[PDB]
Amino acid sequence: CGVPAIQPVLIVNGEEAVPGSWPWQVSLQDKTGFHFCGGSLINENWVVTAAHCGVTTSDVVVAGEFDQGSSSEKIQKLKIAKVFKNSKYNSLTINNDITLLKLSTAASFSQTVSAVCLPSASDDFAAGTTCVTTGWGLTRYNTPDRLQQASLPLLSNTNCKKYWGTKIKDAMICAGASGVSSCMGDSGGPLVCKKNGAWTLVGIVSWGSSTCSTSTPGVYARVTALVNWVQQTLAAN
Amino acid sequence: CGVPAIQPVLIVNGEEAVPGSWPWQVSLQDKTGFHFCGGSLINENWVVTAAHCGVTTSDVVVAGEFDQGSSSEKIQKLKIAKVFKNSKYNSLTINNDITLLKLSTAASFSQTVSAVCLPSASDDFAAGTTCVTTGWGLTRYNTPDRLQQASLPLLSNTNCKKYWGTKIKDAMICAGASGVSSCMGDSGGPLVCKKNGAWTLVGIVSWGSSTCSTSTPGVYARVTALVNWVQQTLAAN
Numbered sequence: 001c002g003v004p005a006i007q008p009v010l011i012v013n014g015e016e017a018v019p020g021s022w023p024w025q026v027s028l029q030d031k032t033g034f035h036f037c038g039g040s041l042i043n044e045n046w047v048v049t050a051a052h053c054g055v056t057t058s059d060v061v062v063a064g065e066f067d068q069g070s071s072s073e074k075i076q077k078l079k080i081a082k083v084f085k086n087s088k089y090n091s092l093t094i095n096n097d098i099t100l101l102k103l104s105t106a107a108s109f110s111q112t113v114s115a116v117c118l119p120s121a122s123d124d125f126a127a128g129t130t131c132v133t134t135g136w137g138l139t140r141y142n143t144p145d146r147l148q149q150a151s152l153p154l155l156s157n158t159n160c161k162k163y164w165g166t167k168i169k170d171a172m173i174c175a176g177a178s179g180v181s182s183c184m185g186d187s188g189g190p191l192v193c194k195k196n197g198a199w200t201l202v203g204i205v206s207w208g209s210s211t212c213s214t215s216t217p218g219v220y221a222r223v224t225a226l227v228n229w230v231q232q233t234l235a236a237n
Numbered sequence: 238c239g240v241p242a243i244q245p246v247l248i249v250n251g252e253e254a255v256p257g258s259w260p261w262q263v264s265l266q267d268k269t270g271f272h273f274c275g276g277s278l279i280n281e282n283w284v285v286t287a288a289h290c291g292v293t294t295s296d297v298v299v300a301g302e303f304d305q306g307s308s309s310e311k312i313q314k315l316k317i318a319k320v321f322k323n324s325k326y327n328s329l330t331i332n333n334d335i336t337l338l339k340l341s342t343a344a345s346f347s348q349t350v351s352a353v354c355l356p357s358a359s360d361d362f363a364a365g366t367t368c369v370t371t372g373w374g375l376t377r378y379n380t381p382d383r384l385q386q387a388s389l390p391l392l393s394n395t396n397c398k399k400y401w402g403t404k405i406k407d408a409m410i411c412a413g414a415s416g417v418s419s420c421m422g423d424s425g426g427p428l429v430c431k432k433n434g435a436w437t438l439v440g441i442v443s444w445g446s447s448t449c450s451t452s453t454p455g456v457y458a459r460v461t462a463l464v465n466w467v468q469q470t471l472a473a474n
Binding site: 030031032034036037051052053054055056057058083084085087088089090091092093137138143184185210 | 267268269271273274288289290291292293294295320321322324325326327328329330374375380421422447
């Protein structure tokens with residue numbers, strides 16, 4: 001996992017990504033074809049997203065897109081067999097914001113469709129570390145056709161509390177406050193960090209500034225606090 | 238519909254309701270028993286809630302509760318056969334925020350469990366009209382065991398724009414700004430108005446002040462703009 005065939009070359013204030021460079025990035029679409037949330041493939045049969053995306057078996061997982069306005073990409077619209085919302089999820093506090101999507105039919109991995117790595121529960125993602133977030137959410141609080149990316153730093157929970165207070169829980173990790181912002185439509189999408197040459201999912205786009213303020217920290221589901229559940233869920237289904 | 242057997246006697250700044258007086262009010266609970274959203278029974282097999290509640294077939298519809306901390310109420314924990322999210326729903330803008338829940342097994346109507354009425358698409362709910370909202374959301378931005386209620390006035394879209402601007406769409410109806418506020422956990426719940434002696438669902442608790450400010454208007458899904466879909470959905474399933 002985590003090594004794109006098409007190497008990425010480095011959301012409000014983001015940049016257009018190189019087509020197919022974030023192979024695990026999928027798009028959650030309603031019956032209507034409307035993109036409402038991002039997702040990350042972890043294997044050919046499972047997608048990780050935000051519990052708040054409120055995905056159902058009537059939504060579809062779309063893989064391999066770059067330009068959502070395009071009809072010329074070899075994309076995969078996959079049916080969802082079932083929705084696994086983490087029982088620890090608290091919608092009131094947006095805590096433990098993660099849901100697993102089991103596909104009815106397996107994605108066909110290619111150059112443009114592949115898996116992101118998942119970390120170990122004990123892994124350390126240090127404050128100051130520069131990671132990348134991707135997605136098709138608003139670029140202006142203004143919806144892009146083409147997939148955007150942005151490099152941004154991890155913050156420590158303590159420093160994040162400075163902005164958000166008691167809203168930040170252990171199962172949360174803050175990123176941003178750097179001149180870029182994840183925004184409406186980015187939710188469920190990946191926050192990845194590169195190490196020993198591969199990308200690991202450290203966060204799931206969860207919530208942030210009501211106006212996608214670029215000077216405010218973005219909040220993501222801390223994958224290290226949720227990976228045991230991911231593993232438990234895959235093991236059992 | 239809309240005529241409680243146990244007559245209601247007239248959420249932040251609300252009041253405890255008379256037990257069983259809002260018979261259509263249900264509670265959406267996760268596997269864990271955690272109440273995350275409200276709902277309204279429209280008949281013995283269907284529940285109307287907010288699309289944003291992100292309900293799945295793994296959540297349960299609970300009917301007949303007053304005190305969620307109690308073990309002595311004759312309540313009904315109903316399985317959900319399927320989730321019908323309105324395809325018009327836009328999560329980015331929280332527009333057309335409605336989902337229908339079809340129960341696996343029919344609720345047993347009683348004195349404490351019954352249906353709310355649905356209006357006609359053409360119905361007029363005038364600004365200034367006093368309605369009631371119910372639910373178990375926070376009473377302080379602080380979660381209540383016992384069901385709360387609050388009377389509050391309808392606002393016109395135009396006046397509401399004054400506070401929320403372009404966020405207010407045609408499928409939205411504002412209520413509050415009156416000294417009471419719907420709050421986290423109230424979502425999916427009812428906004429009912431009494432006329433010709435019965436209660437009609439005019440709104441579905443949708444969104445509002447990030448701090449449940451009592452001087453800010455609450456936003457609810459305007460049932461008149463969604464009732465045709467409700468009827469279409471029931472007709473077909």
